[PDB]
Design an enzyme around this catalytic site. Structure first.
Site, PDB file in Angstrom:
ATOM      1  N   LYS A  68      40.732  50.290  48.519  1.00  0.00           N
ATOM      2  CA  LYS A  68      40.775  49.042  48.028  1.00  0.00           C
ATOM      3  C   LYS A  68      41.090  47.823  48.521  1.00  0.00           C
ATOM      4  O   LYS A  68      40.558  46.564  48.517  1.00  0.00           O
ATOM      5  CB  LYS A  68      41.410  48.911  46.675  1.00  0.00           C
ATOM      6  CG  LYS A  68      40.889  49.979  45.625  1.00  0.00           C
ATOM      7  CD  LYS A  68      42.077  49.861  44.329  1.00  0.00           C
ATOM      8  CE  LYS A  68      41.569  50.669  43.089  1.00  0.00           C
ATOM      9  NZ  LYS A  68      42.676  50.737  42.140  1.00  0.00           N
ATOM     10  N   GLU A  80      38.252  35.191  42.821  1.00  0.00           N
ATOM     11  CA  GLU A  80      39.549  34.501  43.080  1.00  0.00           C
ATOM     12  C   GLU A  80      40.900  35.498  42.881  1.00  0.00           C
ATOM     13  O   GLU A  80      41.706  35.636  43.693  1.00  0.00           O
ATOM     14  CB  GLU A  80      39.657  33.549  41.828  1.00  0.00           C
ATOM     15  CG  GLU A  80      40.945  32.440  41.932  1.00  0.00           C
ATOM     16  CD  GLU A  80      41.358  31.647  40.895  1.00  0.00           C
ATOM     17  OE1 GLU A  80      40.518  31.746  39.857  1.00  0.00           O
ATOM     18  OE2 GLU A  80      42.296  31.007  40.921  1.00  0.00           O
ATOM     19  N   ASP A 104      41.387  45.619  37.925  1.00  0.00           N
ATOM     20  CA  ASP A 104      42.473  46.414  37.631  1.00  0.00           C
ATOM     21  C   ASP A 104      43.436  45.719  37.060  1.00  0.00           C
ATOM     22  O   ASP A 104      44.226  46.552  36.020  1.00  0.00           O
ATOM     23  CB  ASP A 104      43.366  46.826  38.974  1.00  0.00           C
ATOM     24  CG  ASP A 104      42.665  47.958  39.609  1.00  0.00           C
ATOM     25  OD1 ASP A 104      41.918  48.558  38.933  1.00  0.00           O
ATOM     26  OD2 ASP A 104      42.847  48.038  40.786  1.00  0.00           O
ATOM     27  N   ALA A 131      48.918  48.318  40.112  1.00  0.00           N
ATOM     28  CA  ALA A 131      48.589  47.846  38.637  1.00  0.00           C
ATOM     29  C   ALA A 131      49.288  46.743  38.201  1.00  0.00           C
ATOM     30  O   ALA A 131      48.773  45.618  37.711  1.00  0.00           O
ATOM     31  CB  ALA A 131      48.626  48.928  37.782  1.00  0.00           C
ATOM     32  N   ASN A 151      61.975  46.519  38.564  1.00  0.00           N
ATOM     33  CA  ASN A 151      61.556  47.607  39.461  1.00  0.00           C
ATOM     34  C   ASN A 151      62.729  47.991  40.166  1.00  0.00           C
ATOM     35  O   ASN A 151      63.717  47.390  40.301  1.00  0.00           O
ATOM     36  CB  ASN A 151      60.506  47.277  40.519  1.00  0.00           C
ATOM     37  CG  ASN A 151      59.968  48.365  40.992  1.00  0.00           C
ATOM     38  OD1 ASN A 151      59.090  49.150  40.276  1.00  0.00           O
ATOM     39  ND2 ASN A 151      59.934  48.720  42.557  1.00  0.00           N
TER      40      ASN A 151
END
Lengths: 278, 277
Positions: A68, A80, A104, A131, A151
């Protein structure tokens, strides 16, 4: 006659990726003579695979792990959101030109739009992975007011928060995750972007579920099971929920729209994934 | 799982080529999770398509017009008959090495072997174009005694004749085609390698039908229609005939054997082509 429209995917490993079945179920339902070719392409093969799809006159392809980021080197144009995210998972081939998109976060956004608009909303994202980054960017570009990224390693959340503040009109904020995360008052949308619950109906990310209002839209990127413990708990509280299988279907729909200008049937794509997942 | 074994074809144009349907029907019957990808590849794109098949980890591919000579530039090795013919239509990918094969005469030879042995035979080939060179080489390598190549451009027949004489044990002879001619009485096998009759009933190559014998095996490379006017005329005179459909089937079988080391079912493949045409 015998020339099918060609699309497919470059990734490694690819044997467990069901996108081929989902997308071809869509092609077949539409009566479209199109194929999706799932290729196992090593990092040293990516450049030649990309040039190969062009020479074989494919109309598009996906990139998954581990291509990716690396694929950006081989493209002619970058959309963009892909520019801001710094990764591409959907490439269109238009008259020999390679155009990179990132979808995604777009599957989630399409699912979201069935229930409410993102514009002006205050959003909490659990987790700071690939993600989470894409979802945060797509929400910000779609006009969200405030995005909190939660997180355990807060510095990884801070990377996404900084991206949002620096490159978008939205406000981004990072919070370290310790115990059951309590949603700040006025949260409109809660999204799980962790793998907690993936293939485990009994696992859920540590969230104080009582901090949710019945008005809070609750989403989960996990596609299997599509009804995660997290979503089942949210729905039991009276919340509108959005599942990760629907998001994967939407991502395939968007990709094929980019490639071929056709909107495939979501129902048959979804049922194909439900059958695969059991 | 979701990774299929990948095979396919590079050619332009490719929309009229039914190989994909035939081969995939063979794959399906054999329980093989394999796919045949029919790609429209321009001459300017051949090198990148070849590198693409390697990077996408295909196990083999076919080349058709206009790539059969051009593909030689991309090969790591080349099989015996292909080296002689100077063209390749079937490429195996092994450890990132490309090995080129030619099956344009091997389909025919497999069909022929259902009715007779090529060894010691005297053969007339109408045309020097298309698979005429491949057919001449395959016959010669399988022990044919004498091969006459009949062509309007005599020089093209002479090149094939010289190849047979110089590089094989068989005798090659060139013949300038100037309309109807009588076949030698000992002619064992008569093969149309022209496109005369291709998608056209009532068109047949000019030869004296009356010079056929009961014993002459008459063959036609044309796959569509499988029963050309040539073959219908030969059948009417009692000759054993071999059609181009069966030859294409045999090409597909031989190619997949080269790629996968599996023999696909020729009945399911023939049926598939029968339905298509």
């Amino acid at each position: 006659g015998f020339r099918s429209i060609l699309t497919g995917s470059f990734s490694t490993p690819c044997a467990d990726n069901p996108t081929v079945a989902m997308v071809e179920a869509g092609y077949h339902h539409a009566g479209l003579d199109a194929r999706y070719i799932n290729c196992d392409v090593k990092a040293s093969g990516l450049a030649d695979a990309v040039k190969g799809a062009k020479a074989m006159e494919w109309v598009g392809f996906n990139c998954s792990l581990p291509h990716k980021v690396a694929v950006l080197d081989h493209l002619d144009d970058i959309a963009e959101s892909a520019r801001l995210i710094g990764a591409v998972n959907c490439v269109a081939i238009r008259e020999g030109k390679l155009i990179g998109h990132n979808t995604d976060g777009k599957g989630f956004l399409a699912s979201l739009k069935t229930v409410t608009s993102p514009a002006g909303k205050r959003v909490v994202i659990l987790g700071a992975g690939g993600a989470a980054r894409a979802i945060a960017v797509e929400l910000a570009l779609a006009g969200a007011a405030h995005i909190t990224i939660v997180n355990r390693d807060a510095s990884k959340a801070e990377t996404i928060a900084a991206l949002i503040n620096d490159k978008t009109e939205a406000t981004g904020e990072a919070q370290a995750w310790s115990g059951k995360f309590s949603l700040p008052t006025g949260t409109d949308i809660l999204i799980n972007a962790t793998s907690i619950g993936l293939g485990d109906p009994n696992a859920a990310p540590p969230v104080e579920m009582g901090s949710l209002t019945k008005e809070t839209v609750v989403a989960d990127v996990i596609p299997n099971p599509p009804q995660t413990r997290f979503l089942k708990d949210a729905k039991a509280l009276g919340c509108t929920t959005l599942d990760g299988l629907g998001m994967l279907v939407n991502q395939g729909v968007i990709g094929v729209e980019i490639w071929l200008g056709r909107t495939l049937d979501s129902a048959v794509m979804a049922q194909t994934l439900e059958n695969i997942f059991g």
